[PDB]
Structure 1
Amino acid sequence: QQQQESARRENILVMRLATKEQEMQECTTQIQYLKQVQQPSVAQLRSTMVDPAINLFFLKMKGELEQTKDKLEQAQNELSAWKFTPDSQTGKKLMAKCRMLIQENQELGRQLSQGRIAQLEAELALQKKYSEELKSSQDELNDFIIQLDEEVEGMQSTILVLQQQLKETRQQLAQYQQQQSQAS
């Protein structure tokens, strides 16, 4: 039928136009985000601090100052190193710093060695084993809880049966005590 395919074509155009309205929404919200109503304060902040030229210049200046400072301190300690000599305060301090760094490097080496990693792995395995031991204990505890509830239910049932029998005996005794007294 000519109407069915015509309606399908209309559906095609409506689908395309719906996607077009989606892109309208995206572009218009991007416009509203770019040209948003903004305070003077945020514009000042983004034009004075977040200014790309100022940021790049500040980063370059900070980097250059850091490099110059590190080179200066290197040169100062190094000229102290030509001033290194035994039995002098500079010499004693410098050699003591070197030995302290030897000791610290040895400590970091023993704290990073494969032996210490294996020790920590063994401790982790022991902790895991303790965890499955606790879980097995928890399973046993659950079984104990189940058996305790079953015992409680059985005890209540036999309590009720005992109450039944005790009643029946009590009324039988009372009725036969009233009954047998008439023959005295």
Structure 2
Amino acid sequence: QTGKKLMAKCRMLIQENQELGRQLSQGRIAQLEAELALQKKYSEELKSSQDELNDFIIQLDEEVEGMQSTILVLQQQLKETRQQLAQYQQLEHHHHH
């Protein structure tokens, strides 16, 4: 009798849809939870490697400044040594008629 068989067919499809929809749902929750853990792990590694780079950038900044001062000090030392050398040469040349 078709009332009975249609009732059975309906129940069987409802059970399939309901079991399916629970799987889609549990699958989405598991995926979200896995992405969350992985994104948190990444943010820890990001924060740490930025700190390490930022410390080396500070040192590099200090060193670029030191090098610039060294060039400045050397230039002035060279200027003063060159003018003394020149004066001695001018005195010698003059002293040789």
TM superposition score normalised by structure 2: 0.67
Residues 31-89 of structure 1 show CA distances to partners (whole Å, capped at 9, x for unaligned) of: xxxxxxxxxxxxxxxxxxxxxxxxxxxxxxxxxxxxxxxxxxxxxxxxxxxxxxxxxx9
Distance 1:168 1:112, change over 3 A: same
**Residues 100-151 of structure 1: CA deviation (Å, up to 9, x unaligned):** 9759835863455545423321210100111111111210121122011111
Q: TM-score scaled by structure 1?
A: 0.39
Greater share of helix: 2
Structure 1 stretches of 5 or more lacking a match? 1-88
Do the aligned partners of residues 181 and 117 (structure 1) sit closer, same or farther apart at CA in structure 2, a change above 3 Å counting? same
Distance change >3 Å, CA 174–CA 121, structure 1 → 2: same
Q: Identity over the aligned pairs, expressed in percent?
A: 94
More off after superposition, 130-139 vs 112-121 = 112-121
Return 5+ residue gaps in structure 2 as ranges.
none
Distance (Å, rounded) in 2 between the aligned partners of 1:173 and 1:96? 113
CA positional deviation for 1:167: 0.5
Distance 2:5 2:76 in 1: 97
Q: Which has the higher contact order (CA 8 A, sep 6+)?
A: 1
The offset of 1:163, in angstroms, is 0.7
